[PDB]
Every structure is written in C-alpha cells, then in structure tokens.
C-alpha cells in the first residue's frame, strides 16, 4: 500500500540511500507508494514536472516510488497518485 | 499493465536509460521523442513485439530491466503501438 | 505463452543474444516458448536430434525455449510443444 | 506473520548480523537487547515503521536481508513496537 | 514442507555445504524444514540453546532450515516446529 | 512436473553440465546415461530424493540451476526413481 513517513530519522534516510541508485541519492517528509513500473515511471515523471518533490525508485514487477518533499506536497502526490 | 508518458522530461528519459542496455541507449536520440508506451510483457510477446516496433519507423524499442518493454516515438505511432498490443 | 517471429531485425537477434548463454550464442523464423524446465530440456533435446533448427534457453521456475530455423521447421517444432 | 526471539543466544546474534548491512551492525552494541522481533513487512511499511522505531529509545531496528524488519531492545519495548505494527 | 535424510552421503553433505553460510560450513540425520524467516530464526535460536544439534539456513520469503545432528535429536527437534 | 529424456544428445549433456556445479560434472562419465529424470522439486524433498540417489548405484544426482533435480543413469534406474519420487 501507501505511506507516509514524517520527519525522517537520518538512519532512516540511510536506510533508503542505500537502497536508491547512485544517481538518485547523490541528489520533510518522504511518501512510499507501491506501484507496478508503467505506473512507477509515469508518476516519476509528474514529480520530475512538478518543483517541490523528488522522485526515486526504491528496489527489492511491482516495486516501490519514494516521494520527497515538503509536507504538504508529500501529500498532494501521494493524493493524485491514488487516481 | 499499460501507460503512456507524453512529453517526458530530460530527467525522465535519463531514469530510463540507467534502466536499459548500453546498446539500446543510442537508438533514443535517432528518434523523435513525444512519447513514450510502457508495457508489462511475457517474454515472448516482448521479443515479438519488440521486432515488430524495430520494423516499424517511428518508434525506437527497448527493454527495461514478465518484464518491461519502452516504446518511443511520435504520438501518433506510440498510440498505435500500443492500441496494437492490445489485440 | 508461445509466439513466432517471422524475419527477425538485428536488433531482433542482439535482444535475444544478450538473454541467452555464451555457449548458445556464439552459434529465419524465431519460435519463443515459455515453458517448465523439465519440458524446456526435453523438447530442446529434441531439436538437437532434428537438423534444421537451433534451439536456446532465454533468461529472464517457467523460463523461454528459443527455436531458431527456417519458417516451415519452427512452425513445424511449436506445433510438437503443444502436443 | 511475526515472532518474538526472548533472550537469544549470542549465535542468533551472529547469525542477524551476517544478514544486517555493515552500518546497522554497530547498533546491536549500543542498546540492551532482552529480546528480537522478526516481522515480515512491505517495504514502504518496513521504512516506516523502522522510522518510529530508531525515533524511540530502547529500540534498535534493521533490515534482514516483502523484506523482514528485526527490532532489537528490551522485552517491553519490542512488544509494545510488535504491537503497534499489528495495528 | 519437512524431510528427515538419515546417513547422509558425503555428497549429499557437499549439495548442502554449498549451499550454506560459510560461519555456518565451517562447522548423523539431516532435518530439513521450509519455514518463513521469523520461524526459522527463532527455531533456529532454540537449537543453538540445545546441545546436540546445529542450525543453518540453507539458500534457494519462505526459506529453509537444515538441522544436523544424532537421529533422536533431530526428529525431536522436528516434532517441536510442528508445534 | 517431471520429464525423463531417454537416449540424450550430447548437446543436450552439454546444456546440462552449463547448469550444474563443477563438482558435479565428472559424475557423468562415471555413469551410463541412457536417460536423464528431471523433476521440478521444493528444496527439502530435492536433497532428500538426491542422498537416496547417490545411496543407489546406476544413478548419478545433481541439481540444476522449487528448483530442479536431474537424475543420469540407466533406463530402469531412472524411471524407478521417477516412481519413487511420485509417492
């Protein structure tokens, strides 16, 4: 499902830098969405469009977008990715 | 499961080359990219499919590492590659 | 499910080369198949008993038999598999 | 589906450690640890909840390598976060 | 589900060995048990609590515990994870 | 799901040995393989069904990269195996 994690730890950021691509981490709150790749890809590029969040796939098909951001666009993504 | 990216960002066909061949990445710039088809695929369809893309003029094809085939080009072509897959 | 590809691109072919074992490799129609292990082995030993077609695993358990031939012979060995 | 190690060995320790990254290991050392709680979770859970986790004290949380999160500390902290994960 | 392979060969010993650990290789009946990983490292605690036997994963989720050991203590131990 | 090749090529030995352990390879040529078992098997039955095999002489075990147990030997001895491993 969805999540929504407020106010990261640094270890939690750890956590997720290690499971990103080199290219991603070397670029709060942080929103966890699984959804199959099409739709991975094409919410992706909506962030990529949008300022004020930034995008990562997260590994381990159907697999896992991080979403981060300021609070409220956090939300709002997480919002139109449910339709 | 299918989707269309219109208009990709730079950013956007950057995440997709890092997810593809080195072989296949040149083929992106040979084409004119309005947008992109991506489709979850048995293998066989995907090769299949693939061929018939790599036929046609328009679209450019690749792999994304039942797995992920891209399909890039004009609207027009994607569409109907797409619609195409479909059947 | 099964597929064949009639007059494959290069293109084509490096796909499917880059999927399959050195060995296979380094040796038209294209007839793919996805099948049990146990069916893949005893139906690509077939066609090494048969001249006329060239067979391969592609990777990718259910995996993917590759019959490599002439029209009349691929169509011909997708049609055995399905008895 | 979850479970609780109570008072584990020093090889059941040994053993997590192979299958936690090197950065997590360190952790075991710094906090008390009476009991393990193995759950198995989705991932953006997992994160989540491992989140709350290195917010509280007492607690200590890794991946092992739907992915298992290991909660390390004491008896009543682990139950209580084993707790709060079933809700 | 669960196998018990009494006097194992020293081949039999050598499939496992690689596929194992090497803390854990390093170091008769064989039980063999698929259990998911919170079970496994838990029954796996309780035999390292127990003398005469040793644990290990073996590699291949819902994975597998190997428990070596003299044959009363190994079917023991399986009856105890049937509960 | 199980299948017995009788009378093997030598390519079809060939793919085989591509899949298994180099430990495992020379236990072929001290082996008449007229038929080759493969059964698709969960991992605690795979090594169980294989110490029989090993135990029994005119079979050869290995496996082959739920996963595969292949099973060399005479025609007699491998269709018995076959048998035994349906019960």
Known sequence: KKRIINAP??????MLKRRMPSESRNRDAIGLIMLPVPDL???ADQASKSAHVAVSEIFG????????????????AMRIIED
Do not use: Q, R, S
């Not at 730890?9 to 750890?14: D, I, K, P, S, V």
């Not at 098909?61 to 709002?76: D, K, Q, R, W």
């Open 41 to 43: 890809y094409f919410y």
């Open 9 to 14: 730890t640094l270890e939690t950021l750890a």
């Open 61 to 76: 098909h159907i697999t896992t977008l991080a979403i981060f951001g300021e609070v409220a666009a956090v939300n709002e």
